[PDB]
Symmetry: C2
C-alpha cells in the first residue's frame, strides 16, 4: 500500500479514533475526520480536555477501521473478519486563521454530503470563537486488510464462505433536496 | 450524553465483535483492531503468540479498549449544528493470561456464537495443538465510560432549509441459497444496534 491508498481511505471516512498518552495511560476517543489529501483536521470546543492534549503537540495515533465481512471457515480456528485498517502517527498543530477554519468546515461538510454547504447556514467568526482546529500530517503510517474467502484445509461437509456486511445510507424523507435523496441506498465506507 | 451503567456496557459488548485496543509501547501510543469476545462485562482477547501484541498483554499494563457505532449523519440548518449520531465506549483494564485449554475452548465458543449463532456446533473445533498456538487474555473493566448522540438536529433558525438525519444501516447480505438455515437467518439482518 501507498500514500494513494491512505488518501482513498481518508476520503471515504468521516470518523476516526484518536489515541494519546495522558497521565501515563492511553486514552482513545472518537473524532470527526476532516481531511484533504493526507492532511487530517480535527476540531472541537476549546473548553474540552482534548484541546489541551492537542495543544501540547505530543504524538497522537489516529486509527481507522472498516468492517466488510464475517469469514466462516470450515474450522473454527480459521474464522476471520474481512476488514481494512489504518494507524496514522502525527503531531498536531493549531490552525488559528479563522478563514482557514471555515475552509476546514467546508471540507468536512463536503465529505459528509456533497452540495450541503451551499444550501445551509455557514459559520460566522463569532460561531468559531472557542472552536479549535488542528492539522495533523502523517509522521508515519501503516495499513492492514483482509479480503476474500476463507482458507479451508479440508474436505468436510461444512458450508464455508463470507457473510458480507454492507453500510448504506437509507431513506430520510421523500421531500428532502435532491443532493440528499441521491444518497439513498448508496453503499459507503467502500 | 454519557453513561456508566453496567447493563449499558454489556448490551454494547454483546452486539460488537470487533474493538480498538490502545496501548503504550516504548512510550508511543498504539491502536490496533481486535476481535471482541465477551461474556457479561469480561472481554477476552486472542491471537497469535508470534504477534507483538502478545508481549504487550503479558505485561499486564493498563490498556484502553474502545467501541464505536455510527448510526446517522445529522444535518442541521446551521453547519455548526451538524453532527453524527453514534454510540461509543472506552474501557480500561489490566489483562491476565488464561492458561487452561478448557477455558480457551469456552472463549472460542462464546466468540463463535456471537458472530453466528448455531455455527460452533456445525464446525471443526480447535485441537489441543491448535489451542497451544493461540493466546487468550481476560480483561475485566477497572473503569469505563460511554457517550452517545441520538435524535434530530437542534436549530433556532426559521430559514427554509431542510434538516434531518440520514440514517446509516449496517446489514448482513446474502451469502447464497445453499447456506445452512442458521446462516440464512442472518440475510438482511441489521447489526451493531
Amino acid at each position: 500500500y501507498s500514500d494513494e491508498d491512505l488518501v482513498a481511505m481518508l476520503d471515504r471516512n468521516f470518523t476516526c479514533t484518536v489515541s494519546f498518552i495522558d497521565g501515563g495511560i492511553p486514552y482513545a476517543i472518537p473524532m470527526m475526520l476532516a481531511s484533504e489529501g493526507k492532511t487530517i483536521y480535527l476540531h472541537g470546543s476549546m473548553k474540552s480536555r482534548i484541546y489541551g492534549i492537542l495543544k501540547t503537540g505530543q504524538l497522537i495515533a489516529i486509527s481507522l477501521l472498516e468492517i466488510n465481512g464475517i469469514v466462516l471457515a470450515k474450522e473454527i480456528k480459521n474464522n476471520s473478519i474481512n476488514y481494512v485498517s489504518a494507524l496514522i502517527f502525527g503531531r498536531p498543530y493549531e490552525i488559528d486563521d479563522t478563514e482557514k477554519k471555515i475552509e476546514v468546515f467546508r471540507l468536512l461538510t463536503e465529505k459528509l454530503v456533497k452540495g450541503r454547504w451551499d444550501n445551509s447556514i455557514k459559520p460566522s467568526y463569532e460561531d468559531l470563537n472557542g472552536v479549535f482546529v488542528f492539522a495533523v500530517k502523517p509522521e508515519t503510517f501503516s495499513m492492514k486488510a483482509r479480503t476474500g474467502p476463507p482458507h479451508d484445509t479440508s474436505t468436510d461437509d461444512i458450508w464455508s464462505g463470507v457473510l458480507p456486511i454492507q453500510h448504506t445510507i437509507s431513506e430520510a424523507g421523500e421531500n428532502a433536496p435532491e443532493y440528499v435523496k441521491s444518497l439513498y441506498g448508496k453503499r459507503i465506507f467502500i
